[PDB]
Design a binder for this molecule. Sequence first.
Ligand SMILES: *[C@@H]1O[C@H](CO)[C@@H](O)[C@H](O)[C@H]1NC(C)=O
Ligand SMILES: *[C@@H]1O[C@H](CO)[C@@H](O)[C@H](O)[C@H]1NC(C)=O
Length: 398
Amino acid sequence: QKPGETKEVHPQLTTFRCTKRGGCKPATNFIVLDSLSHPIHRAEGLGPGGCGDWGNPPPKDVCPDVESCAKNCIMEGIPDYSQYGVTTNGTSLRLQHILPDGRVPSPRVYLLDKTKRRYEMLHLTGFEFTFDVDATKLPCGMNSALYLSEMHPTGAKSKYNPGGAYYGTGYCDAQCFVTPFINGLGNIEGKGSCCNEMDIWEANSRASHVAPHTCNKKGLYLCEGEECAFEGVCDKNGCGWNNYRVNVTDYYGRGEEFKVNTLKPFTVVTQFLANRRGKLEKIHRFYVQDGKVIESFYTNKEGVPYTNMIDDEFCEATGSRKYMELGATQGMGEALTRGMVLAMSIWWDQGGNMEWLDHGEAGPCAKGEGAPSNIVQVEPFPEVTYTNLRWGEIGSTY
Ligand SMILES: *[C@@H]1O[C@H](CO)[C@@H](O)[C@H](O)[C@H]1NC(C)=O
Ligand SMILES: *[C@@H]1O[C@H](CO)[C@@H](O)[C@H](O)[C@H]1NC(C)=O
């Protein structure tokens, strides 16, 4: 869309780059909200109204084609991010799903580099990514997410999308959703926005999930028809790793009897182990709490290979068929080597209660517990805090 006049004031966040010799050195980064969460309205002189909702093409009256859409639809800057539940303090990023006044902003943000005009590109194959998290205010049904998507580095800044990464344009993920704007351009044909996605962290205080999702395309791919569906170009399900799905029920949870106790802050480490040729082979998650390393669990389920890391064998044996067909671990690794953008969000799921994350085989949440009206009876103001985001050499971040 065309940037309006209101100024965009991005929250600053200090992050780190670590090496075994130099330790962790500070780096300057900024946060930007998704472009479609910015106020988007019709140009002055046009009647009042918007330029489409999630799930649909933009309106035929103001957006008959890309060029008209680019001048009729205005995206204002956000001068105060705290109104969207996003605040930073030093090296911490706090995301509030629901504000004290009742609004539910459910924010999704991306990490910009120091110039504010390009996303920070992470190249993680062969490296490690680590952060500290406070997940205590996340009951069943909530998803606090921290993940990577293969978005364009400037948000596809172009003639008709002058705002670019500075306004958070260019989102994509493995679900191939239809949004009114794609790469900052009106999505006249109603295509889906698809790209490789690595879900480092999808969790609440009750369950923790990790999942790479491959696509057989590079960068953002605009799908149509069956390309957007289950048998299309992207792996909707991903190759999931959750201690509950592999029958280890005492590893993560609220309370002293769990190895990772979600009643207190803890550190999450994820290593992308590659062979000497640079190809991704395994993904390894382990945690640090109260100065103690808590090693990964090993699977403990009949029919599943004994292993403490995600790999092709584990993925194939657990039925991650689309994952294996659209590239497998090696294809996930190639997207990670090409460069991915870091996204952080907090959300709930009115339609399905986030059951794949923490219910049944995936966790301890009862049927109906994850509904929004029940979440707020347990915690009226769910929120997550991410602190000390840091990446670098294997073994150097913790
Ligand atoms: C704000 O950030 C600084 C720098 O990390 C930290 O020392 C201080 O404790 C933080 N304040 C709060 C309220 O967390
Ligand atoms: C799950 O683990 C328990 C032991 O903790 C074991 O008795 C049971 O057989 C396992 N289930 C499967 C399906 O592997």
